């Protein structure tokens, strides 16, 4: 049935996440994942065409969780520049602390597309907000959104293979959207609201 | 000696580029490539472990050619901002007009590392100069250069799906501390022909 497939995909996603969180997205095979979901190994490809799709579902789950948490806290700040900066700083910190996250930004070339499906609409919103209040200067909204995540990935990959890294990165993104060079740094250094 | 091994590698690179420039990166296999280099299909793996390494070498060849060209023109301008902007615009224009380039950005996950090792040092140089001059405001030179290419890739991928090069360059200027208002002006000045 289609209902059986529905819950199995869900169980596989849960299995993959639990295992990768412990050992790394790169150190878990589908045999172990199918075991965790309680199904025959040779039956995996009955729910996912390949490994990548499953990886993407796990990444969506991770990014969406933070996205929702960010929408709960951050947006409650008045300065659009702080909302955007704070959001970015949380992503960077999560990347340097979550085993599974670091794995997404390195061993996954589809990180960008996933980030765009889940956090893109949120970032665009935050940027549009800053544009409407004259806080930001942006010529193309979609470009700023996609470049932000392209930069995030590169930024996290560098940091991972190496401290206010999050602050420095956020400042650069603030400057990219039209914030005075000196002001940007200050805004990216404001106390960061707890995300947990 | 293994000197022939080196010659073959070079011939394979030449073959892949010629073929991919006419048919597109994704429509050319080991079969066609080895044929252009005049060797058997199977012997391919005696020169490259995978098709991916050859693809990277072809991209290196294309990025280096433009890098060298830029080093002999753009760098002659007096405004560091315009040197950086113009260089980025050439990269965007090539990406949208050259069949082979489009393929590197939407058919190769190693785009960033290849760009970073060939153009990275060049962009970093131009950014440092602009930092010396006080034209830019950058806290971490490596971060700025790796972010520029991260952005370039994303920007090109989007475009590939009227003056997009100017807009991209302006945003990068803004990212490095250039006044939002004067950024678009600099990014719209006549572009010096690279070749
Ligand atoms: O959820 C997000 C992610 C990145 C930037 C932002 O403003 C919001
Ligand atoms: O060769 C390059 C490529 C991109 C930016 C730059 O300043 C130089």
Residue numbers in the entry:
A (entry chain B): 24 to 185, 191 to 224
B (entry chain A): 24 to 184, 191 to 224
Question: What text does the study give?
Answer:
Here we report the crystal structures of a novel transcriptional repressor RolR and its complex with the regulator resorcinol. The RolR protomer is folded as two domains, the DNA-binding domain at N-terminal and the signal-receiving domain at C-terminal. In addition, RolR is the sole TetR-type regulator that has been identified for regulation of aromatic catabolism. RolR is an all-helix protein and each subunit is composed of 9 α helices (h1, h2, h4–h10) and two 310 helices for h3 and g1, a stretch between h1 and h2.
The crystal structure of RolR complexed with resorcinol (res-RolR) has been determined using the MAD method at 2.5 Å resolution with R factor of 0.212 and Rfree of 0.245. The structure shows a “Ω” like homo-dimer in the asymmetric unit, which is similar to those observed in other TetR structures. Two resorcinol molecules are respectively bound to the two C-domains of the RolR dimer and the resorcinol-binding pockets are identical in both monomers. The binding pocket is formed by 5 helices (helices h4–h8) of the C-terminal domain. In the binding pocket, the resorcinol molecule is located in a internal amphiphilic cavity, in which a cluster of hydrophobic residues interacts with the phenyl ring and a hydrogen bond network is bound to atoms O1 and O2 of the resorcinol molecule. A number of hydrophobic residues, including Phe107, Phe172, Leu111, Leu114 and Leu142 from helix h4–h8, are involved in contacting with the phenyl ring, while residues Asp94, Asp149, Arg145 and Arg148 interact with O1 and O2 atoms of resorcinol via a hydrogen bond network mediated by two water molecules, W1 and W2. In this network residue Asp149 directly interacts with atom O1 of resorcinol, while residues Arg148 and Asp94 interact with atom O2 of resorcinol through water molecule W2. Interestingly, these two paths are closely connected each other via hydrogen bonds among residues Asp149, Arg148 and water molecules to form a unique recognition mode (Asp149-W1-W2-Arg148-Asp94) for binding with resorcinol. The results show that the binding ability of mutant D149A to resorcinol is totally lost, while those of mutants R145A, D94A and R148A are dramatically reduced to 8.6%, 5.1% and 2.8%, respectively, in comparison with that of the wild type RolR. It indicates that the DNA-binding domain is rather rigid in res-RolR comparing with that in apo-RolR which should be unsuitable for DNA binding.
